[PDB]
Every structure is written in C-alpha cells, then in structure tokens.
Amino acid sequence: WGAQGHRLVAEVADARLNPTARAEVDRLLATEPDATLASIAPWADQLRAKDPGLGRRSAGWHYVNIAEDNCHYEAPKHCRNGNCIVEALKAQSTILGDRSLTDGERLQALKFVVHLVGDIHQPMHAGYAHDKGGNDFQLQFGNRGTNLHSLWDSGMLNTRKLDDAGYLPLLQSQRAPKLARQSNPQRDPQTWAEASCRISMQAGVYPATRKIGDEYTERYRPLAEAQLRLAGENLAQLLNRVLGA
Ligand SMILES: [Zn+2]
Ligand SMILES: [Zn+2]
Ligand SMILES: [Zn+2]
Numbered sequence: 001w002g003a004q005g006h007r008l009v010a011e012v013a014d015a016r017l018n019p020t021a022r023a024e025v026d027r028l029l030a031t032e033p034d035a036t037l038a039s040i041a042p043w044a045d046q047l048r049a050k051d052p053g054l055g056r057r058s059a060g061w062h063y064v065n066i067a068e069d070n071c072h073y074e075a076p077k078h079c080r081n082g083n084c085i086v087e088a089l090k091a092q093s094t095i096l097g098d099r100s101l102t103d104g105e106r107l108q109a110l111k112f113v114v115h116l117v118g119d120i121h122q123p124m125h126a127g128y129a130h131d132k133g134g135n136d137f138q139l140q141f142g143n144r145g146t147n148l149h150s151l152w153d154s155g156m157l158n159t160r161k162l163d164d165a166g167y168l169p170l171l172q173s174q175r176a177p178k179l180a181r182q183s184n185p186q187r188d189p190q191t192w193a194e195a196s197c198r199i200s201m202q203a204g205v206y207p208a209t210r211k212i213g214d215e216y217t218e219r220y221r222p223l224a225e226a227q228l229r230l231a232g233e234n235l236a237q238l239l240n241r242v243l244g245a
Contacts (some may be wrong), residue, residue: 002154006041009041009118012232023225031103060185061088062119065129071197086189089116093185097242121231124152126196171229183241
C-alpha cells in the first residue's frame, strides 16, 4: 500500500490492542519521540532519506511472487535468502517478541511488523513475478497512466478523497471479518500471502480492458477496503499475541 493505506491498517489495529499489548506498544513507541503506530506504519517504504542501506537490504521483504505457482508458496523457491514478505514477517515477529533485545531493536521490528502485515494483505504484493506484481500491467484509470500494482496500492483508495480521520470509521463500520481462533506468528504469514495471491488471480481483478474507471472502482475498492480492515484486525491479533500475553 501507499502511506495512507499503511496508516489506516495501523489505526484499525491500534484500537483493537488489549491492555497488555497497549502498554508495551506505547512503551516501545515512546523510545522514539513522536512515534505512533500510525506514524511508523509507512516507515519501511521511506528508508531512502535517512537509512538507505536498510532500505536496499529490506526492499524485497514487501512482496512475494507466487501467482505463477497457483498461489502455493514454497520458501526455497519464492524466498531465497529469506528475501520475501512471508519469511521477513515471521523473522520480525520473532525479533519483536524477544524481550532480551534493546528497545531500539524491538521498535525496528515493530515498524517492520506493522508495515508488512499491511503489505501481505495487498493482493498485488502476492502476485505474478512476470509482470512485477502488476507494475507491468499498464492501465489508464480515469484517463491517468498507471498500472495495476499502483491502482491497488493507492489509486482506488485515493478516489475516496478522505483524510485518515474520514477513512478510518468507514473501515471500522464494515462487517467484522472472521479471524483465526488464535495468532500463529510463524504459520499465518504464508496463509495471508496465499489468500492475497488468490485475490490477484480472481477473474476480473486483471481487467478485460486497459481503460478503466468508475466500474472497476465500484467493484474492487470495497475489496481493497475489506483487505485494509482485515490487515488491521490481523495486525492487532498478532500484536496481542506477541506483546499482549
Ligand atoms: Zn505498502
Ligand atoms: Zn506496492
Ligand atoms: Zn511496503
């Protein structure tokens, strides 16, 4: 997602934290002045200005290309060197839960976990290798030149013309998604990436025309918004388990 999508996932999650996780999240955040779960949510996309080395090191962690393999993830094939979102989310969840680390080390892991739970729910972050997750599927969207990846990251969300305070209660007023009975931090990332990939492969998500507009928005913006709500609920359930026991 773009930055607004990341912040909305965090804002949905923040309100669903249990008291234990609330307290520990606030304590980790307070080690960095002005940090909130929302403000840190875009951080992993913004590393070029102040931590370009980490940005280079972690750029592959934002996606996994499994649509060629019918949305059946295999770590050795799809995640060489741990360089994909499934293995990165698993590792950063472990690091976040390691109370023996410094606050700085745990906060960095929190920033990755918040971002990556968002990205692993963006269908085009779990799509085809051969068109770079839709980046090479060129579109005109209300006449603007774009691509299917960007359309899902921000194009459709931008059509609401809402700030976070207007968009958040829209997401919260949706029907509640049915979550797993418990967080499994090491198994859930694969489940989520495969679910996202299956959306990318649904008939119509790749549109029949390159010229699209309101018809596509009216059909699929609700699904993008459902995915933001689902990501936020999944992020809260994960933080409640890792930080809230
Ligand atoms: Zn994103
Ligand atoms: Zn993206
Ligand atoms: Zn990202």
